[PDB]
Amino acid sequence: SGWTFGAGPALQIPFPMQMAYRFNGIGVTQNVLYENQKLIANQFNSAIG
Amino acid sequence: PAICHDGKAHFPREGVFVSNGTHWFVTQRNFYEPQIITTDNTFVSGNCDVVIGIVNNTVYDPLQPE
Ligand SMILES: *[C@@H]1O[C@H](CO)[C@@H](O[C@@H]2O[C@H](CO)[C@@H](O[C@@H]3O[C@H](CO)[C@@H](O)[C@H](O)[C@@H]3O)[C@H](O)[C@H]2NC(C)=O)[C@H](O)[C@H]1NC(C)=O
Ligand SMILES: *[C@@H]1O[C@H](CO)[C@@H](O[C@@H]2O[C@H](CO)[C@@H](O)[C@H](O)[C@H]2NC(C)=O)[C@H](O)[C@H]1NC(C)=O
């Protein structure tokens, strides 16, 4: 649900779209995420490991 | 997540791509004000060969009528 469940009713949203919105919040265009997704996922998995 | 019109992509400038049963629209995040997909609402960058979950659809043009 992203951050919506902290204000009103919980609203569903796919995870890659949520990450695109989060990138859009630090001054980076969203097309960066959708063009480099497998690499970002692998980096996240390695970081959490 | 995106729309591939002619070998390219079309990401929304501000808002999300939302479809009812048949047609497609672009709308705001926190309200429901559907609009027709035009070249003003979208910016093109890419090749629609790497985006996952893209749809074909079509995008209108305001310059051609005039
Ligand atoms: C999903 O949303 C779209 C956008 O509104 C719906 O398409 C629109 O549906 C209405 C209702 O059928 C159409 O209005 C009708 O127009 C005909 C003339 O073509 C008129 O004789 C009828 O009395 C009525 O006013 C409207 O034209 C149509 N939009 C377009 C661009 O054609 C669509 O119906 C929605 N999905 C579903 C499953 O309903
Ligand atoms: C979106 O358009 C592309 C471009 O035509 C379609 O890809 C072609 O689809 C035909 C029909 O199946 C194939 O014969 C071609 O080999 C495809 N070309 C490529 C480069 O993939 C695609 O199928 C369309 N998608 C939808 C959902 O309509």
Side-chain angles (χ1 to χ4, degrees), chain B residues 21-28 30-63:
Chain B
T22 66
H23 302 106
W24 282 89
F25 294 115
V26 60
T27 184
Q28 309 169 359
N30 285 103
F31 211 71
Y32 191 29
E33 182 145 300
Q35 307 147 22
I36 299 169
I37 317 287
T38 77
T39 198
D40 186 74
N41 291 318
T42 72
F43 71 93
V44 56
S45 78
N47 204 48
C48 84
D49 270 336
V50 68
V51 187
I52 301 301
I54 198 158
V55 299
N56 282 40
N57 210 358
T58 180
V59 168
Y60 262 60
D61 194 11
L63 175 64

Side-chain angles (χ1 to χ4, degrees), chain A residues 15-37:
Chain A
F15 203 87
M17 302 215 58
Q18 167 175 171
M19 294 299 291
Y21 282 0
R22 304 251 193 184
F23 276 170
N24 207 2
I26 56 186
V28 180
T29 44
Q30 61 188 358
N31 63 343
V32 165
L33 180 64
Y34 294 149
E35 292 192 1
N36 303 315
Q37 183 168 350

Side-chain angles (χ1 to χ4, degrees), chain A residues 1 4 7-8 11 14 20 22 28-29 33 36-37 39-40 44-45:
Chain A
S1 48
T4 63
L11 306 171
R22 304 251 193 184
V28 180
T29 44
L33 180 64
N36 303 315
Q37 183 168 350
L39 157 70
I40 288 190
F44 186 90
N45 291 353

